[model samples]
Target chain A: KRKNIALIPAPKQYVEIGSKTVLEHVLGIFERHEAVDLTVVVVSPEDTFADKVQTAFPQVRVWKNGGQTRAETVRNGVAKLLETGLAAETDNILVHDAARCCLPSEALARLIEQAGNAAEGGILAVPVADTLKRAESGQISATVDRSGLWQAQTPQLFQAGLLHRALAAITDEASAVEKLGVRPLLIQGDARNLKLTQPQDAYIVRLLLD
Target chain B: LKRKNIALIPAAKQYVEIGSKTVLEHVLGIFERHEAVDLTVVVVSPEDTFADKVQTAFPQVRVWKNGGQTRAETVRNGVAKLLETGLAAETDNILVHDAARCCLPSEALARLIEQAGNAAEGGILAVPVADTLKRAESGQISATVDRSGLWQAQTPQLFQAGLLHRALAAEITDEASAVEKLGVRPLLIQGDARNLKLTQPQDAYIVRLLLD
Candidate 1:
């Protein structure tokens, strides 16, 4: 049996893939991860993409949630998982993405290993490759040297408590700290874990994944 | 501030009879203000009366007059002269901007150069396609094509001289397109639509409104 890991996978309405929705691909990664066990997928009730996860994979458990923000959706999934009272001892939760199919295995493994070692929290990160420029009134007004800057990606890992704190802090916290790149303790994600926004982005990510 | 060799290619014909002067003025104005540009070369054809008009405004601008039949030919001839003299070859980078589009914000050029300089493949100004798509055949909608893999190519294509020179030799229609054909991916530097290419008389009026 794989270690008890909470895989928080969320999907949106209107977004559909070839045969499966984006969330299916995201949950599929957990199924392949040898470190994962007792996976719970949280989807929106308005999600037209997935009719039922049970219809596809009878073993996997599915829960519905009212998702407004990303933090809210993951929180809903964690609550559903906790309700089952089946969360194995030594709990580790992975808040991953459904859209990002090409998030590098090396980086995901690194995030998990580092999070396991730190016992606090960990995330993936990518170094900023382009010179950052701030545009004001549709013109480049300022240029920022991206020397030490890094872009954060998903599949952020933490001890069960830390994960709860981060999510709660995101909802309850007044400041921008919970948004991303706010907390110093917050983990940095790898750049390869790119979110699929447009069609070419998918092609580019798929090319890399292949 | 870094000095660079900037080649301004104004694709115009003497008989095209439109806001050709406006295009020339727009491009020349950019050259005058570009802090990184130590030398500016305006590449045009022998049929370019716009060159003489531009000379009145910018006497210092180097004019590369090559009588060419096509827009691609004009660009190739001008690039050849620059490479032959080896003047631009010494610069850190070359910015190939359009004459038809003089509205490129100076900051966009700076960003593009910086991005291209570090890029594994050269970078060019670009905007992601935002409209729905329908492929047509003989004025009838044949199929609804997927618009995911498309982007609008803008100019001020920045690259190392050696790479651009080899890429130019391939004789592609556009600078960015040429590089893409050479099996090198070009980085898409974000740009605004205020920088419009002047193909019609209405285009000049739009630039005037923007400037005003």
Candidate 2:
């Protein structure tokens, strides 16, 4: 049996929508995914929102994300999963962001199906349609070629052992595997699955949810 | 005297209706609100019937129907009109914006002018690339591109009228790309998500949500 674990890093407090915080929406997506065996919600040590997440979904395991940075948070979660024997070293682990609340289930299935069989692994992404520009000193240096460019999204799927070893000094999960000379597969992701980074982003997400 | 700032909008599509107004009108309204913008020139295709509607609604704006088959050619035609009508001088700043980008606020326009006015080369509104990028090959990931200092280019790209005209004398994509060919680096001012170009049908829904 192929065991798949989802690790969601939600260390910060953000504004909520009508009834739910962004983290609730994110957790809802994973809870609905049939392939996800275990869902681990990573929160900061002092995070008060973990109780709400647990209260809403008792099935999800809440863990204190005691890391200085995002990379460390994800690493700690992966280590815990392996240490507790909740997931084997060879089991699949999907790392996702709490801000990307609109991640569709179909996209998650595609990532798992593709990365499960592949040697390297895979991440959800969308093709870069807009023209890219490199700027310097508040000026356009040159027009960067966007021919085969794809904007990376989550959840990035990799074996628990591989991801744990690869993430040792990396900022993002993809970079860790990239350093190990393995190119991750790029599963096509939906545009509506946008990250709620800025304050104005909530407007689009609200429209999308409605 | 301060150099005149003109807004050039390349409008071709006729079916773009957001609420009661066409996409062209919504775009014009933003530039009209900004007092620093001295003039607005619109380039429309000969076959576009909606151009007449925009003309009827905004009498203060000048409408030119000399648009060509391509975006580059259409913008060139609009620039040619500015040169011929004496509406723009060589040193005057011309801000080229997309008619589809209707949500561009007056604040963004003011910021563009303030930054582009003092720079060695002019500037355009752009947002930094937050997502990690991957170079794909044959539907598979080939490599991960570093997102450091990378930005997604947006419209209302500002440059001197003479410089834009000279740069557009060659084949180009956006006005800034044309200027880049001339070895000039246009500035990249921070742009907001509200200034998104309405490319797909869902974009209109989002734009409506933003505007409403």
Candidate 3:
């Protein structure tokens, strides 16, 4: 029995695409997996959209997300799911991006098994492939070394308790490092798990997906 | 003989002091490593000596001069002339790059161009944004802006001459952003900054350090 699988999304306002958003895509992937338990989507202040999510997938629960930041919304969603008997604290929790639509079931299973390691955390990430630099006011300033840095992608699998504590312990609003520390075992995230952000990204992904 | 078309667009203003000849040679050296592709470097200057230097050094390179007050302007002119010479068609794909940058790995070039060959709108070499950022006010850090959705835009932006000319005519600033503005998505090629561009006074030292 895994804990609640909470799909935390940034503020999404697309009414037409809203029904088939990243949350819908991720839920489809998670539900297909016999990963043994509950599911829910934590959306930002969109109660109507939350209802729509619940209406779309009757098996999955949808909750209105609270809190000032992304980390907090996820925490609130987990607690609500636990309160409603959807999942337990001991249950495994897979926190993934609503923006990432291509996370495969095999990768999810591998991440979950690796997450069982009590020693530390585990995540799906890709190595930093390019040379990094810091530009000062549009001028090249410093060329930062990228020897050990890996770009952290989502579906960061952890024991429910560990992730809760990590999220709770964070106070800094500065960086994602506020939400990360103990490195979990790394699983190769298929290059397909791209996040949509830029205006044209959805178009690109649509072409790829279609 | 396989026709190799390589275009290098130099980012230079009339007042902006450029790098040493050795830096240019090293840049040409990286391009020279490609045995298959015929290289064409489009410089944005009418400096006869620079042309002479290019001819003497990398005689294989077809050098063209473009005059424009802005970076995008210069590239459009160069690309247009390349098309007019019956050398490349509007549908023919090419890469526009900064000469100051030596960070473009030959492999990055190969991959980006190959991807562009199959892509419709073409692609731009980009890397995911990793660092936390802040809005600085008067050199004082203010708010920490979320970097989760950001990508560090870079070049060797691959595109067809038709699409690029259309974008440049729209007067878009940078290549990647311009592509985005035209409702065309730019693909990230994951190029690193080690391909350093020799710009400013301190860049030479950095470039030497990288060489070592």
Candidate 4:
């Protein structure tokens, strides 16, 4: 009954949570969003995982022509979309993360609502709470003032042409945009939307899955 | 971080339940089982009865009812007690940790010892800032501050008992800050998110998951 189709409950926790891999969960999240017209995952080449993704999410568009950097990979993905006339230059493109699997559905909604209304675009992020110190040669060299410091999370939503141009210039699209004199709005992010890099991170997300 | 680490936990509150053990038990147990940990003590207010339960069960971890009005005072008392009768030499490292940080993993404790154990500067467990930081004015986001080369400081901050003892005499907030007054830089080692202290309504739930 929880199979998919209509806008699901909290984006159907089972579809994402019950999935075998982080990609499966991440793909399921955007795929279930009503506002998201398309869902795609990109890779450079060589993986049995791509086949698995297709079998599982037959609806998702998988582009294997990935590049060295994620920003480049996104540019390539959007370039293909442009060639096929499936996407427009003015179209908004979202680059979500695969590693950060516990991204809340409501956060997805908040991003859509806020970014869509903004002029330049918006990237989901969280405020820094702890005191920060700069490490130099295994010793604290300076105590960096964390006032106005924020950590960026992905699904950095931007227009197709802007993101493509930005990526063509730099692997960090936001940095490229900064070079172009454009500042992406920093919308607050949820703490539950943690990246799964460390062992403890996996433990935290596992609990969130349940 | 140590000739031996005497992880001094200031029991601001430890009666809270997580699993089979109260919060204090889990914290004390880290020092009990670890090879590098030589001693563990829980310091609390003289009137607090939680020390009775702590002393009754975990007899290995000594309880000192010498808690001061401020956190610094409690740590000062704990350090004084540790120094009495040559119980600890100045070469030993004193890890002033949080009692509420019951989920403190042994891996981090070992890493703290491996890195800062012999370093002249000492060390503290920390995590790199993962979120885009923002400075707010009044109530709105002003701008995004660059997060390059920055880490969010955590504990147990490991320092030489001699350095710590000398620094606390003048005093500051965090133990590391006090040590820095002597013009020293503490190395930052990686710590687990699980090592976070129990606070907020949801932390107990997270702690419960980590316990299991």
Number of the candidate with higher TM-score, 3 or 4: 4
- Write out the backbone clash pairs for model 2: A138-B187, A139-B186, A139-B187, A140-B186
Best by lDDT: 2
Pick by lDDT: 2 or 3, better one: 2
CAPRI rating of model 4: acceptable
TM-score of chain B of each: 0.84, 0.94, 0.85, 0.93
lDDT of each: 0.56, 0.83, 0.58, 0.72
State the TM-score for model 1: 0.49
A1-210 per-residue lDDT for model 4 (tens digits): 111111110111123344466777777788888777777777657644577677888888776777776666666787777667766666777777667777778777877778755647677777665567777766777777666666677667777677667766532345556566667777766667777766567767877776
Interface RMSD of each: 20.7, 1.9, 14.1, 3.3
Off by over 4 Å in 4: A1-19, A45-48, A79-92, A113-116, A159-188, A198-210, B1-4, B13-15, B45-52, B65-73, B84-87, B128-148, B171-173, B201-203
All candidates: TM-score: 0.49, 0.88, 0.52, 0.79
List residue ranges in candidate 2 displaced over 4 A. Answer: A33-35, A46-48, A104-119, A206-210, B117-120, B170-172
Rank by TM-score, descending?
2, 4, 3, 1
Fnat scores for every prediction:
0.00, 0.78, 0.01, 0.54
User: TM-score for the second chain in candidate 1?
Assistant: 0.84
Best by TM-score: 2
**Ranked candidates (DockQ, high to low):** 2, 4, 3, 1
Give a tens-digit lDDT track for model 2, residues B1-212: 76888999887543477677777788898887788898898988888766777788788888887789888888888887797778888888889998789888778889999989666478989998989988898767677787778899888988888889999996656888999999888888988778888877656767776677
Give the per-residue lDDT of model 3 (tens digit) for A28-135: 777777763656666657456567667768877666666677778777876775666655666656677766766657767766665545345455655544444444
Better of 1 and 2 by DockQ: 2
Clashes of each: 7, 4, 11, 13
